[PDB]
């Protein structure tokens, strides 16, 4: 439930969290980079 003060204009309620998104830059080779990309709670697959 979200209750606020009256708004004059159609203003956005910018709702966030403290959600984690961590990336490891993997590299087994000199020349190419593996991008281990994952938003942790919001499944990328």
């Amino acid at each position: 439930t979200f209750e606020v003060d009256p708004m004059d204009e159609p203003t956005l309620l910018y709702v966030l969290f403290e959600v984690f998104d961590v990336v490891r830059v993997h590299r087994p080779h000199r020349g190419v980079i593996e991008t281990v990309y994952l938003r942790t709670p919001f499944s990328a697959g």
């Binding site: 993997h26 190419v32 593996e34 991008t35 281990v36 990309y37 994952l38 942790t40 499944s43 990328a44 697959g45």
Partner: protein
């Protein structure tokens, strides 16, 4: 010179030649394993993380 490497023929001038002793080149099957692993990719991409390797 007509008998040194010639390999004497059945008819002195034939029509359609076979494959024996007419130097049929066999370059050996160039064997490389895998650039990326299939078994390592299926497990991650279905459960969570996205990759580019």
């Amino acid at each position: 010179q007509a008998a040194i490497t010639t390999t004497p023929r059945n008819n002195l001038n034939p029509r359609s030649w076979p494959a024996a002793l007419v130097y049929q080149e066999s370059p050996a099957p160039t064997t490389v394993v895998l650039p990326r692993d299939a078994q390592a990719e299926v497990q991650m991409t279905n459960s969570g993380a996205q990759l580019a390797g």
